[PDB]
Design a protein around this ligand. Sequence first.
Ligand SMILES: CC(=O)N[C@@H](Cc1ccc2ccccc2c1)C(=O)O
Ligand SMILES: CC(=O)N[C@@H](Cc1ccc2ccccc2c1)C(=O)O
Ligand SMILES: [Mg+2]
Ligand SMILES: [Mg+2]
Lengths: 368, 367
Amino acid sequence: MKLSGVELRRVQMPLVAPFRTSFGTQSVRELLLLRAVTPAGEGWGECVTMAGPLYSSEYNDGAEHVLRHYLIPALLAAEDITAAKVTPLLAKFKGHRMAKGALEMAVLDAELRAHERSFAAELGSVRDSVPCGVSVGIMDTIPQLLDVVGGYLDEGYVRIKLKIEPGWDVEPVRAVRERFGDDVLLQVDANTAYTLGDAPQLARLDPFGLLLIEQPLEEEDVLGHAELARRIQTPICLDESIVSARAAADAIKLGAVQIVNIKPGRVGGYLEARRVHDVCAAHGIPVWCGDMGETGLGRAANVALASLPNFTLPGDTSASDRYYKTDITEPFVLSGGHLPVPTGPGLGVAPIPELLDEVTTAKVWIGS
Amino acid sequence: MKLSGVELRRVQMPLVAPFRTSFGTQSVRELLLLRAVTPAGEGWGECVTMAGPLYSSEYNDGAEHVLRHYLIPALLAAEDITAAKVTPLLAKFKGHRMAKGALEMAVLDAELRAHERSFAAELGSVRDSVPCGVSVGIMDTIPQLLDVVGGYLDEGYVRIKLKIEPGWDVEPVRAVRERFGDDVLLQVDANTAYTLGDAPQLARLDPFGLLLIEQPLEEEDVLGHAELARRIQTPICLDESIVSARAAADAIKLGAVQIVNIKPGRVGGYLEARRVHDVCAAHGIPVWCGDMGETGLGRAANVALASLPNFTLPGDTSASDRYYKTDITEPFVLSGGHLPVPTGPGLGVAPIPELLDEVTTAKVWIG
Ligand SMILES: CC(=O)N[C@@H](Cc1ccc2ccccc2c1)C(=O)O
Ligand SMILES: CC(=O)N[C@@H](Cc1ccc2ccccc2c1)C(=O)O
Ligand SMILES: [Mg+2]
Ligand SMILES: [Mg+2]
């Protein structure tokens, strides 16, 4: 098929409750959507960049720019396009993975819609539904955290992940363990906020039986993580560092990681995410599905991905209402702690135009 | 000191001759300059991004953007500023090293100009001049390459580096060795164009006594390089992979590298570059100064950097007229194969306003 053009939307969606992370607080989610147009029909992609370069180097304005001036033109110029061929067509351009991933997603949704095939089917789903956990931010006070956690447990979420940062690590975990007991699946995530010198402090988490600690150190410090794993008992999970299947293989060979968070956007797409899944599986490394506050479009693709065989831990693909009062698609609703895998062609969901329009702040067409 | 504001310039300078690399051909250099203004006075920084993200992920429009909307504001908002404090003030922002490095350069030039101290002095120079090599692009034909190389040798350049790429590796090297002999300092640079599966082809370079092969594989594939080093005799040098002092330490511990190319911009600044120099030195790893076609401003800072003790191989800091008929500063002129280290305060050079203006395509003030 030949790409006719792509529409770039900016979109802005308020969060039910502000969400605090070691790199800041977020009240509203600003994001990029893409509508790829082909002779056959349309498909949708979502970019997981944030407003500024605080989680990784990519951010909304920068992704929009590289998409407009480099990535989309290079696809418009090709005689034939496949989702798979996206990667080699964009290979000359270094990095910009979240951007490439978004564009691949859109192309893929189009391709698959035209073959009446689901994201699940293409990726290799073996399950109709997936158990879901929830990620809980940093709070101002312990009792406030305990209320939020108890709330998410009552809704039937299967696992709790706490954001952490120097100043907020051992106490919150101790408190959650004293209140809710030792049988709750419990894990933490630093989003890079520690250094190796903080090892004794992270070792203080040893006694609380956490599943894992996620990205304690900076993105590039793979060897540091392997050192850290020799000094603590909590298993290391990597997120930011895992930018590709190769990077996963490398981190595993070096003993830097025992469990991997897959975020499709972070690795340059759903197809590379499948590869990460398979590489980890070949080494005995469990994976789970990460989340970047996606709309229902990305959430639908993530739920499909999380239904692959080696996703053996609950993911962060929480229900739509954990982030948004009003999703721009048919919302995802937790049911017995699980989310159901979409069945339609492509994503198996699409934006409801009235809701999308409420929430769109800009729109531009990139054609021939 | 309190940063008053920064001026961003986009400039455009034609190259004496087009320059071909494994990621493409370039006829004109578009670049970003920064003029940092303080109560004390001014300083200059240069960004080494290119027009598009072909060498790394950063490019001119993208750097300008992250500078304008993130990096410069975060410095303007600080009570007190030092070159050293730039790093922690900008640490919340991930990556954008070439951009940060350009900004740090400008702040540093200002700070040092105010203390009447040279870049050389601040960085730890031990030499007044530095031996200079030259980088030669991919050519359409072998005889055309041989003419260009013979030319640079007549001008007295001390070492030759050839750009390489699948299709253009063993033949160009063989030809240069047959024509100019075994005593010429000779090396190659792939700018990431091979994979580990190309090992037998790179092993084909074994017999030609190259000083090194630079960045045969992709930026992130450090372990791959260590594997490659076990299968070839040419020493591995890394460039694109060496984004920081830590990354240099990591690559060295893994045996992925025996010689390191320092590009200040690529590592986030002249200060981090000094750290890369010192880390490599502590591990017995020689370094040499890389080049991104800088103007005389960046060239002046680089020559100063290259005068540090562990720069023991000739760098790519070639003379101004290797790239530009007309530099925007007092030009650098090769003399007995060397370039002299600037002596004035800061960079020791500044743009000649009439020259800069002819070549400026845009200009904006951030205050
Ligand atoms: C899912 C999780 O806890 N965090 C993501 C980071 C992240 C990034 C952007 C977000 C935007 C809106 C809401 C949550 C967000 C979470 C991660 O695991 O690092
Ligand atoms: C110095 C060298 O041979 N190459 C640089 C890449 C490079 C990049 C951009 C350039 C722009 C104009 C002229 C030369 C350029 C060289 C390097 O080592 O990777
Ligand atoms: Mg995470
Ligand atoms: Mg190089």
